[PDB]
Amino acid sequence: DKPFLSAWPSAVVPRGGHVTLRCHYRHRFNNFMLYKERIHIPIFHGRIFQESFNMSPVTTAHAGNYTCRGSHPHSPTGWSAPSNPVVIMVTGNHRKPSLLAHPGPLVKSGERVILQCWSDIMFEHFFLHKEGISKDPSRLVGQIHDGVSKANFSIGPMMLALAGTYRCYGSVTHTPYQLSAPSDPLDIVVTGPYEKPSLSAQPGPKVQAGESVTLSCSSRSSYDMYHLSREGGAHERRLPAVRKVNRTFQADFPLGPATHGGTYRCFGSFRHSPYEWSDPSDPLLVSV
Amino acid sequence: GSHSMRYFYTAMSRPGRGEPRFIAVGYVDDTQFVRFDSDAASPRMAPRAPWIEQEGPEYWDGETRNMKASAQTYRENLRIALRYYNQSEAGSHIIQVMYGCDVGPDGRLLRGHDQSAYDGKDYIALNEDLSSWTAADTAAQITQRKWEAARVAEQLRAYLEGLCVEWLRRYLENGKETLQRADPPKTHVTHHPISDHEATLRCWALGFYPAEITLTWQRDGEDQTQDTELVETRPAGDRTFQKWAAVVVPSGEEQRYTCHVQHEGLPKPLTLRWE
């Protein structure tokens, strides 16, 4: 008689945010008591939740390790066995750490990437969390070297399930369920096995000031969007693909006024899947 | 005769009721031989037919490993389907997959299959050529563009021509005595009065394998299709099957009626009658 305890939309939640605990027992989101990691001490002086327990606005007092017990009337005890444990982690309590991808955020399908979390603050543990509904974070102890605390999260074999927006957090010794503010987000993109597009310049890759240059991304594969990336990525540009007379799917990226140029690559992608890209096109050097 | 191997996958989201569940089952004709359920404490591909139990540890580990990756792929597939269909994150949805091969008497490929469904309706299917797809709606049309762009049919065709046919052949030799020896049905006719003017005649077929069978009632040598009640073939629970056919007859006319049974374990069709 084990209930199913869950947190909605996420168990990793900012202070001031909202999270609901649900206790699914005997084909219902029925009555239950909540317990903290103390299997016989019900919280809020033995409060019986008549429905899902909505914690809003979220405070640091909500952070913790929970189990529930569903109402089991005719059993010796009027309550079920303990549920699965759900750890509510409350974010926004310390300065954010930094997050970096090694060798970079674009990962070939089947391969591996290191997500490095680091801080000047001495954090006991580091948490890596992919953006989404009902996502579980990974934890590593913080390593210490030359005044910095750090952890290396190995992600792979790369596939769509591992692609997305990642954020990392630190926690300090006496408050394990209290996380820092999140690091700046990192977009991890899976490349391939979708066929590489073709990248060309119009009228060509050699240009001088005051003259326009357009980069054309093309394929016979039905991509819905194209991504133009410049070596030493400041920001990727994206445009919808348009079907041509000869059945190619193309996008034209006009380079603006006084463009510095450099090395370019392009990628195709599909509607509703922004972190899943084709193999990169061959590089194109644009001269000014 | 001809034989078939199929894998059936069910992936189901259930928010607030459990984590997304993935169930895989394997069949050789009408016999289930393996299973995987992501809900077990330690999930593994597991034997379901005694003839597969003596496959070495390398077979079970290799299958467990592939099933774990499939559960991970279908969990993500449920997520993408919500974006495709503009559906709430609170609802429960189901993806179903069926794939496998049909071989002839020689043991050579007759037909390859790979079919998917979303919420009980066709989503995407591999065509008979094993090199093109049929998409049922605008959402599956996105999946088609991705699979054509990644050359998915090519990998499917190599499985269906090679490994699928080769493994089916190995399984047929493994379980030769239950898979390739047709068990004829045990038959009998029962009588049940309804009133003083009518009665029910029921023809039974029990303990048969394979599931395929034909039961018909004839009145003086004419087929009683319009008035025959035919129950769905059901499992006996011991890898054999059961079926019955009933006809309403006027009292004192039972002698005019004959039951006819056709099954591969029967060299000639059987004619039965009540007495």
Partner: peptide, 10 residues
């Protein structure tokens, strides 16, 4: 034996 899962989904 089951088909080796594609790195690619829906």
């Amino acid at each position: 034996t089951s088909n080796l899962q594609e790195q690619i989904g829906w």
